[PDB]
């Protein structure tokens, strides 16, 4: 079987974490290993105001490129570094119901 | 919140699966977007005589560096491809609870 349980240890195992970005709400989503890539201060929720502000500020537009709205089935593809330093890949879709996107992020020391 | 339905809408997002291996039970098991990469004949469960059979016959060495036993903390990294034609990166790590490896597979049309 499967469980929250396994997808934490292969999410932990792999360094990385799962994104779901609503932008009705203002809330983005993450699950997985948030902390290891520099993204728990906005784990397990947070508005974009609070994802931008982690960005590294020459690195924003990068961010920006996550949460910019577009129709269902637009590739989210986007790499920045947030406070601490470290560089993420966001690789994801715009989903078929609702205006909503989802996707993974990982480290660039490991994904390309 | 995040449940279930959240795991499988990000990881189809990002057309990546999640991987679980035990080899003391001979268990491989899939969650994710395994039928979009070519592994939907190994999901949700399989055994490793089906993972290595699914392989194309000239990559099997690079499929065995996924079931290959290592000592905890060990990194799994391995490439190949399965029926059908899809190369797929496999990243993880043999965990420290028992003698089990987890991690992601992506496609490298998209992660390197």
């Given at each position: 079987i499967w469980d929250?349980?396994?997808?934490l240890?292969?999410?932990?195992?792999?360094?990385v974490?799962?994104?779901?970005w609503?932008?009705?709400?203002?809330?983005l989503?993450?699950?997985?290993?948030?902390r290891?890539?520099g993204?728990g201060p906005?784990?397990?929720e947070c508005?974009?105001?609070?994802?931008?502000?982690?960005?590294?500020?020459?690195?924003?537009?990068?961010a920006?490129?996550?949460?910019?709205?577009?129709?269902?089935?637009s590739?989210?593809?986007?790499?920045?570094?947030?406070?601490?330093?470290?560089?993420?890949?966001?690789?994801?879709?715009?989903l078929?119901?609702?205006?909503?996107?989802?996707?993974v992020?990982?480290?660039?020391?490991?994904?390309?």
């Open positions: 929250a349980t396994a997808t240890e292969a999410l932990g195992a792999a360094d974490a799962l994104w779901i609503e932008p009705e709400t203002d809330r989503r993450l699950n997985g290993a948030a290891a890539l993204l906005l784990a397990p508005s974009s105001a609070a994802f931008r502000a982690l960005a590294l500020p020459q690195d924003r537009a990068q920006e490129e996550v949460l910019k709205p577009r129709e269902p089935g590739e989210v593809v986007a790499r920045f570094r947030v406070r601490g330093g470290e560089t993420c890949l966001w690789r994801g879709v715009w078929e119901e609702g205006v909503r996107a989802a996707g992020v990982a480290p660039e020391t490991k994904f390309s």
